[PDB]
Homo-oligomer: 300 residues x 6
């Protein structure tokens, strides 16, 4: 019968996707996080897997949908899939910052629900818990959080903070590990309340939604805002994310670096920028002065 | 059933992939290429779809595989799938530069065989048709080409030139001469002085070169400096890197090409400009020749 | 009598200030704006003098106050720009405008000077909050025109379009668009960035656009970033984008080159249809003559 | 009676100027200069206030005039583009007044008047012959004046002031350069000297920490200020650790971009093994040696 | 005997030097200068060869000496440029010019070569002191033309203007302005910066300007800085500013890219009407064909 | 008799050339190389003089010819003067050549050493180079043939012969040299193209300073390494300093070494480069490890 006639569309898709298979699922599993450090992976968009030195695995904003698949905004997904949600086994908590599509996913929920411990909590704002319950997540499996709330997941202390009434909609997270803290801001705009968090907490690595806003739209932070956030949070490292995912929001992360160079001495910036790549790993504090990530080029 | 129980790995995949669905298939179909111009789309890696003013569609090196999927060379595919091969309907020729896995695809051949006219030729070197016939493509739909051969597909005249990856059976370079202009496809060739031969013998408007960051001890992709040397030798007006998008381990900054060009262009009287493309994006010769950098539509 | 004994603090101040004397007052008065063009002067902060081809003289946000003069609210805001125009030397004027009631935009001494030295013909134009200041200061209500987004005021050659302001509403602040036969000028006052710049860019033709720029202190959002300046120019579909307000406050001192560098990186990819322009206080701009200049420099002589 | 009807031109001027009021006067007075350091303030043009660790206050080239105020009709279009950061009439604590040369921009009758009325009986006026002559004429008693030639040393409380050679394009009676040696470091004030090879002489003979040079964009057909490349050559010649441009702030027609110095420095520093860094100051701003020597660019206090 | 045993130091030298041989000699002779243009060659240091459309050949500041050849003019000055032109291969010439008497500009071996090889009529034009040296070396006084600032010497279709120099006078140093039908060339010899460049720019139409460039050692001023190179271009109202002299001495090694970088920062703000141009020794320049190239490269062949 | 008639072409040449005379010859023998260091000089092209802490003198690929001297066949003209006089060489311990190409071997240098130096100084190179040396008259007994793998000890300098790299067996024609001294090592690649086997040399040996043949390739020619290649070689060799040479000698191959620096500034952090580039000048000195961080060389200024 030959191959050019026995092959169907379904047979191609289901043997090719996701792009990375379970390579990163395995890498995360095999990672031994040294004392005094923490490890994290960029999962696309605002998705971050976080692993403390105690071995605690935390997943925040992991999204596995796509953009426009037909003509029937031109938002097309420009990043591949680095992590297979259905290959996830070890997990200690699933988190969401807000209920916007790019941040919360049914497939991630379904995957965890089928394959993981009947004990893994789904942590998010009221509207996210609402959205989870509707997909079939039991209410007892959910932890509703609002600004001020502190959730202890093993050695990872999760602080829910203000995002920019709205206490139902969105939160920012500060992940306190024994090796360092991670600030995750979701799809938030720039707010002066970043400075409040910088005054009340020690923040090491800060993540913020970067992207090129189309004419007449403001949904992402600019290159200048990225630096203002780093200054306000008193961070040591500022990493842009979210700029990877959408065709129409395609942005140059180098803008952040160039402005940083111009402003760092005059404004006494106490942080460095760092340009990540999707699927890539970051280790605090080992990678803090690196500036630019590159994938493993080969073992050799 | 709740969605956390009904959804499986397989249904999620069939719902999400390819990422772009048929969006680009539809855009390529709707594209009215104006006289004196040609349109093309970057399909990932060295994959190029070309459409001339006469509506002639051509697909070169369209690869739909992936890199490593498990730990059981750490090459991971870093490019999403912008085109659905099984959505292809209008096509006049399928082309391959060489037999290397990243340039010839069974699923693409299967898709064209199932959905397109029994008139569409499969053009490539001897090693390529051997794979095609082996997969079940009729020997009658394949055309074997070697350096020097010229094939006519509607208004697009395809010139098979020397490749720089015995040899002649394995790999060729293509020069697609349309009425609107010409395109040079170098596949995965290394740098060669014989680019000067092509630039001397042929009018070359746009040129594509395999670009990437070579790992320590490996030479497989052209450097930023070689990209500009290729442009000079081919006497092109636009130089566009490709291939740098696909493999994680070869991740390269195409801005190096621009920076070197800014330093060298006046001194060396460069007749071309560099262009930084994005996968899934369109390029129109000659309208986009001075754009320097591609941005996706913003809406 | 010796000079070290005859000189008093008041005698020094009265012969030195304002720094430029009536130099700019003279230059503006004698400037003959060519047909098909308009002339413009930066008066510090967001203060702008505009002169049409028909000789219409319009003044916006002219501020003549200063910052802190002693240690004893909180903020160490010190005026870092000299006084380029003498308000009490203003003679030929057609309209006096203000974007909002904020300190740096509405001035008692400028109003007083106009009342004492200019024609009773000259209208004071601004939002409800601004006229409430003017009336309470001594400007008669018949001289004032209250404006809102949508309102159009014709002053001889110049047509003034009051548009939506994005200060943080309609009683508090307005943006201005000045239509002259030579071209248009967008004055955004002290507005933060908003998407409605695109609205104004769609409905109106905008040639030159001014935006409040500055280096925001930690935990403050009061001025626009260098990136926002480029977004404003894109949304307004302007041909020239010019920062201002970054001159006036010590603690808001910014680098206008930041805008140029970001522009160079973006211009091709984003297809920017405008150029940035770095201006200097007391300086002149002539649309469209100076649109491709990039940077202003004061007259050098010789 | 309404404000509009009562306010005059004089009442506005007298309640607005000088722009900074007495803010900087108070800051200087309150400033506690740490041992091993010296504090310093840019007063505009080439005006420098210097305060040593022992509390000694020194005022150099302080100028409180302005440029053109009207047209009239030949002359250059010089408009003062710097505000007034310091009120001369609010000066109380001072140990010495100095001038580099007799030029209009470097010596001020109103500053002299203010000091004579408000300050101590024994505060000296240090300068070359011609500045002393000018001072004496204004009514400054001559017993309060100290004439200095290149070579002379004047010990004012805590600060050893060395009078050195100044440069044009005779001279000893017209202009001098100052090297201020404090227990916390040394300051080289070159006034409005054009570049000269004898900067190497002062660099060889003296330890110089901070160097100030008159920078500016010279108009076509004029050479009055030093270029950007000149500024770096001065730093190398003086063997300084910090090089700060001044004088570029004051005149509209001499508007210069200080970043020009930084860029050239980045191009030349390693090849020529420069032992200094440039520093871009702002008028009214404080500098502290050696704490700020690596800062590159000044910014005014921002607050919260 | 074998090659290893027979070869002498002196024979090798004669076989090897000058480096370029007669390559540039042949190139200059064969050069068909198009109407409305002029050709130019950099001979090293301040040495220039000019050729008008009529075929008139003029040679300025050609010097064939070298620096220190041993340890034992008391500092390490090594010649860092090869010899691109052989003076003892020169045939056609219509004038020999020198700007001043200092060792690096006037040369005995060149003067001798023109007398021995080149035809009669050929004048030696220079200031008073250079004439004393030519006569002192054995050039007939009938062949020497003494020039002061203000003198005009016509050499076929080339009109030579002797202007003021700015070394360290009138008898000692002159600057030249060469007027050809194709264009003009300003040659400033070894002059430092002066305000009188503006005088020449007002009175004459200057196309190409050459100035002595170099990195001044500590405590020495002998060459112009990159910034002064730009001030000269502005003063002369040139269209093209080309640095020379920076090639010759090891201790003066300079980066002409400084001129370009400073130009990119000032061009717009200061409205420069010229372009910088980085040449290479032995290189050719064609006004106005090359005025926008920015940088020179030697021919590459193939 | 006049000085103008006495002078001949020969008198000029034999008094002016070589340009540097014996300046560098004296400096080399004067040099006191410190313990834990090595010093080296750039003799033009790929010519390197290396001097150990023990006073061992090594001379690699010293060339003293020139390019084209007449038109009547690429236009390759020598753009570098002569810094070292071969006939002033006295103290020498070994003479080395990497391959038999014209630009890397010289009869006059061989002749000079034969005549003026000790009778036990070996001539080291691949067999194609000794065939040339014997053919010129050097006794076969004083010649050491090398292949990749061979190690030759010359005092405290351990000389490793490694694989050289041609594009399109070869061990007869070309080798690469790794010079191991007690104070550090030096990798000299000769005129090799880029190769993957630089990584083999990097893993097996400890390499401090690396030298690569740089230059601008003409259209349709691949003879020199690109700027990007220079960086790749540094990474492969695991070097700490990467220095380009060869780019100096030919007019047609004129290149800008700053490209290597700029590309390095873009790549260094992303790729974790353990080396940094160094721009040398011909005749200059390099001291490892003292000058490893200098980035750019400048000639002594005095």
């Amino acid at each position: 019968m030959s191959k050019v006639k026995s092959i169907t569309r379904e047979s191609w898709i289901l043997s090719t996707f996701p792009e990375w298979g379970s390579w990163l699922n395995e890498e995360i599993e095999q990672e031994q996080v040294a004392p005094g450090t923490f490890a994290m992976w960029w999962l696309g968009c605002t998705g971050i897997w976080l692993k403390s030195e105690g071995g605690t695995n935390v997943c925040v904003d992991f999204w596995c949908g796509t953009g426009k698949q037909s003509h029937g905004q031109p938002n097309l997904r420009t990043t591949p899939f680095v992590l297979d949600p259905f290959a996830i086994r070890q997990i200690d908590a699933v988190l969401a910052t807000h209920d916007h599509n790019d941040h919360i996913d049914v497939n991630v929920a379904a995957a965890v629900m089928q394959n993981c411990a009947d004990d893994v909590p789904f942590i998010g704002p009221k509207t996210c818990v609402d959205l989870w319950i509707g997909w079939g997540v039991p209410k007892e499996r959910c932890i509703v959080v609002k600004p001020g709330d502190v959730v202890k997941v093993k050695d990872i202390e999760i602080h829910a903070l203000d995002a920019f009434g709205m206490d139902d909609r969105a939160v920012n997270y500060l992940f306190k590990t024994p090796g360092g803290s991670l600030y995750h801001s979701g799809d938030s705009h720039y707010s002066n309340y970043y400075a409040k968090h910088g005054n009340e907490h020690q923040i090491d690595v800060a993540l913020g939604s970067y992207g090129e806003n189309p004419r007449g739209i403001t949904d992402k932070m600019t290159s200048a805002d990225m630096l203002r956030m780093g200054e306000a949070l008193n961070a040591k490292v500022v990493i842009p994310f979210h700029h990877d995912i959408w065709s129409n929001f395609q942005a140059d992360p180098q803008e952040i670096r160039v402005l940083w160079e111009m402003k760092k001495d005059r404004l006494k910036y106490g942080f460095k920028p760092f340009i990540w790549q999707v699927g890539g790993k970051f280790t605090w504090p080992l990678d803090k002065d690196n500036f630019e990530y590159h994938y493993p080029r080969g073992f050799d």
